[PDB]
């Protein structure tokens, strides 16, 4: 579609961080942040049961 010149103008004329400069940046960036927070909270949360001995119940 040859958006290269227009995206050069948008990307160079921007006081935003580089991952935010595209107009579709939030469309990736918000669910990625939520999914990342869940995926790094939960296996840290399963460490007390690991060092306690409580394996996961097979239900």
């Amino acid at each position: 579609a040859n958006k290269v010149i227009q995206l050069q103008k948008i990307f160079q004329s921007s006081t935003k961080p580089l991952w935010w400069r595209h107009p579709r940046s939030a469309l990736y960036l918000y669910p990625f942040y939520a999914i990342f927070a869940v995926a790094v909270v939960t296996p840290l949360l399963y460490i007390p049961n690991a060092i306690r001995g409580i394996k996961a119940k097979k239900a």
């Binding site: 040859n2 290269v4 991952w19 990625f32 939960t42 296996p43 399963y46």
Partner: protein
């Protein structure tokens, strides 16, 4: 130009990268991957969806990293000749590292074949394991990999010469060729006689060919993103490092499969 105007630029070619979170984001994803798989291997998590989520976060963080690097190379124009030379040499050294991993796997194979154990039966392959025949399916695999190499070099030279529809058709044909390789490899793993748990033959066989299968899935992703960037005019005639990177990766994977084919089949049988 003048001196006032020369004062407004970099004065050294190399890229001064903006601060980005994707290193610590990929690192946290890799830690959660390692933790969740070490807790799901030994039953401390009930099911595999945690490891699936950690792999998903690692993939999307890597994709966002690559989105930032194609943004800096395309829209910000920060990749001059010195940075292009640098990333070319960096991809070459990473390719050398993967080749050395495969040399380690070949060492495992050559040890366990040149020293046949007495529990196996002092013969290679062991008794009861019918080997994969070379001429049936892997001959088709290796000739479509060789034609993939011919197709990427034809499409790359069609890109340099300026012809768009020849280079696009070449890159599309070679991407479908290597996914035909991936499909034939999955078909070979589906209808095969032995398992990965069937001794050291199944062990080092599925280890070597599965690591090469993984690298060809990675090359499938790289050929796909290179087709997208050539379609949406990201690749110029004299400025493309994603393409040169993906075709030297294609040729190195072709040479690795050639050695894998000749050893693991024409010497394994």
């Amino acid at each position: 130009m003048t001196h006032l105007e020369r004062s407004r630029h970099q004065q050294h070619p190399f890229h001064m990268v903006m601060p980005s979170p994707w290193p610590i984001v990929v690192s946290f994803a890799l830690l959660s991957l390692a933790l969740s798989t070490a807790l799901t291997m030994h039953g401390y998590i009930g099911n595999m969806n945690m490891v699936y989520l950690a792999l998903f976060v690692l993939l999307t963080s890597s994709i966002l990293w690559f989105r930032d690097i194609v943004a800096e190379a395309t829209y910000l124009g920060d990749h001059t000749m010195a940075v292009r030379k640098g990333i070319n040499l960096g991809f070459l050294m990473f390719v050398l590292s993967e080749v050395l991993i495969f040399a380690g796997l070949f060492w495992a194979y050559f040890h366990s074949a040149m020293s046949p154990d007495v529990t196996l039966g002092a013969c290679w392959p062991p008794v009861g394991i019918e080997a994969v025949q070379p001429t049936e399916l892997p001959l088709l695999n290796t000739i479509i990999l060789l034609s993939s190499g011919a197709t990427v070099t034809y499409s790359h030279h069609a890109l340099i010469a300026g012809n768009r529809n020849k280079a696009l058709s070449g890159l599309l044909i070679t991407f479908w060729l290597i996914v035909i390789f991936v499909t034939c490899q999955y078909i070979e793993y589906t209808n095969a006689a032995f398992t990965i748990s069937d001794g050291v033959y199944g062990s080092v066989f599925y280890a070597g060919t599965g690591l090469h299968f993984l690298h060809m899935v990675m090359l499938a992703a790289m050929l796909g993103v290179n087709y997208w960037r050539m379609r949406n005019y990201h690749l110029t005639a004299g400025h493309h490092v994603g393409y040169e990177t993906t075709i030297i990766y294609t040729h190195v994977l072709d040479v690795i499969w050639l050695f894998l084919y000749v050893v693991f089949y024409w010497w394994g049988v």
